[PDB]
Design a binder for this molecule. Structure first.
Ligand SMILES: CC(C)=CCC/C(C)=C/CC/C(C)=C/CSP(=O)(O)OP(=O)(O)O
Ligand SMILES: CC(C)=CCC/C(C)=C/CC/C(C)=C/CSP(=O)(O)OP(=O)(O)O
Ligand SMILES: [Mg+2]
Ligand SMILES: [Mg+2]
Ligand SMILES: [Zn+2]
Ligand SMILES: [Zn+2]
Lengths: 338, 331
């Protein structure tokens, strides 16, 4: 396996002590993922900037101690605010997407370090189980799903396209449900905190893929004749499982071409929430951080999922929320009712 | 489960007696295939023209009797040459792509009808096994591969991009190998005449997918900073397996989100070669028709030990042949 990627990023990470071999695999992952889920572009500078947000994120996912968004320094030799400005300067969601990405670095770096055992990560894992709507919003930011919808419009110079909050919530729910359904087994093997069907009932995993895919086709059909909006649908379609066959990050080939097998720091970051946290996350962490249910089983710190275990009365509410996805979709996207 | 597709094609096939639910299924298939392997467009008119070629093709592929390019009239209520001009007028391969398509209609509708037993089809299936280069050229046309590369350029108003014969051959070999690797099982339980790894040793299936996927990543890299060539790469990448997860035609849900389980007629049509057959097919049929190898078993053809190894060396050779054809891979 040779690692192929544009030379623009081939001398990235000069300040960073990792094997050249590993820099290679990281650069390739950012290229592969960018080309899979933003398969069209008009703006090379934004494309590469997006690639650089994936380079930092890949590193954060497996060596949290190397990435500290709180230090407000160079991150891995990159000036993060300026990379974020190259990407989104003059798009509707610049400031909010800079928050989305910093939240992703903060949480992913904590999860992939000692700091996993700290207050921020405990509050976050607990806050995931607050509610099914809360789950999908945090999972959105963990997967950079609305960040990548914003990035796909930006990289095609669509600086005038945007969505309501509820519209982002439906689009990312479709994307994340589709991915999380295909990535189930892989996520379990890893002991993930962040996988839809650690929380959502396993017996709905096939039905929920099917429903999401179908709605996606329905919105796609409704958006016909506007080729700009194809960049949003393509993100979700290509992210929602297909990347498992396409990216060397995954083991389709290896598996013989088959699919299916310190409370101060918290309070300081909460005070920096306008900088570091997506709109609403600080509230999510204050309300859900300690658990919201007496029967749900929390751990004192964080071939099985590593998160909160929902009690069976909570799981019904999760089941029921999944089961009214079509109505919740048609609701924010009236064009589906037609 | 209901069928979703732009309302532009929702009243196609008014001349065709089929249940509205099968029309719906066919419209969905064409809409879903188009969006999957041509994920961008600028030219909606050309995009609908492409969907309609897929609509006709879906119907040829399961009821050959309902499609006859030979009869020189409208096909399933479409003016075929008109859909093809809507798609390709001003593009560099209009005449060739029209011949390409017509060959697909000719061979697909024979395969899926009584004509399956004719000289023309008998010669075509023997011609598949002439050589591995021949297989990939004919598989190309059976899958509308280069037809779809051309349509991806057209649907994005790239009226001036084209490839040499050699360059299409490699591009479609990438796509057809990736697709045929993944679709192996779907095709074994179908008894396809047209599957790569019925000819290519089955053990190279995994290697080949890997290597094709690796070359497609190398090509993608080389073509960086030229957004218009993404439409070529995107076709091969999304055609080559990922459609099994994305289109309802396939069984990803139903399999629990898993992948991996007369001679007068013949001579009349050769006489209409410039109209009905891709450049060179006539020859492939003339020379290949009665088999090429004393040892190979003809009547899909079953290859001898000598031939099977020659095909092996042709697969193993792929990187060299791609780099030969596309200097951009060497660097
Ligand atoms: C920047 C980012 C979102 C992730 C870094 C690794 C990358 C780029 C993976 C491919 C994109 C996916 C599937 C992200 C889901 S977050 P996940 O942790 O569930 O991804 P995984 O399933 O482990 O690949
Ligand atoms: C336009 C066309 C070429 C085919 C008509 C039906 C469609 C739209 C199928 C999907 C496109 C593919 C993968 C073509 C392979 S032909 P095959 O018969 O070997 O593929 P199969 O696996 O049976 O779909
Ligand atoms: Mg992960
Ligand atoms: Mg078929
Ligand atoms: Zn509970
Ligand atoms: Zn032989």
């Amino acid at each position: 396996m040779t690692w192929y990627y544009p030379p623009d990023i081939a001398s990235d990470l000069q300040s960073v002590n990792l094997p050249a071999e590993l820099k290679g695999e990281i650069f390739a992952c950012a290229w592969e993922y960018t080309r899979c889920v933003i398969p069209n572009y008009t703006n090379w500078n934004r494309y590469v900037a997006f690639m650089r947000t994936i380079i930092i994120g890949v590193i954060a996912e497996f060596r949290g101690e190397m990435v500290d968004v709180t230090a407000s320094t160079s991150i891995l030799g990159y000036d993060l605010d300026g990379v974020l400005a190259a990407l989104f300067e003059g798009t509707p969601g610049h400031k909010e997407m800079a928050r989305e990405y910093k939240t992703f670095l903060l949480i992913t770096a904590d999860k992939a370090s000692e700091r996993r055992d700290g207050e921020l990560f405990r509050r976050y894992v607990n806050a995931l189980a607050q509610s099914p709507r809360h789950w999908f919003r945090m999972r959105d930011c963990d997967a950079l799903a609305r960040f990548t919808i914003a990035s796909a419009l930006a990289c095609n110079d669509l600086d005038d396209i945007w969505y309501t909050e509820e519209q982002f919530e439906i689009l990312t729910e479709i994307g994340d449900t589709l991915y999380d359904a295909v990535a189930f087994y892989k996520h379990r093997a890893e002991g993930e905190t962040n996988s839809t069907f650690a929380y959502m009932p396993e017996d709905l995993r096939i039905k929920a893929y099917s429903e999401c895919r179908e709605i996606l086709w329905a919105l796609d059909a409704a958006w016909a004749r506007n080729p700009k909006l194809v960049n949003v649908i393509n993100f979700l379609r290509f992210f929602g499982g297909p990347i498992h066959m396409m990216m060397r990050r995954y083991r389709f080939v290896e598996e013989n071409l088959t699919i299916g097998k310190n409370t101060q720091r918290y309070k300081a970051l909460i005070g920096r929430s306008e900088e570091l946290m997506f709109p609403g996350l600080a509230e999510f962490l204050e309300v859900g951080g300690d658990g919201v249910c007496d029967k749900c089983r929390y751990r004192e710190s964080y071939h099985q999922f590593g998160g909160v275990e929902l009690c069976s009365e909570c799981k019904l509410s999760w089941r029921q929320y999944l089961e009214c996805f079509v109505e919740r979709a048609a609701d924010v996207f009236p064009e589906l009712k037609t």
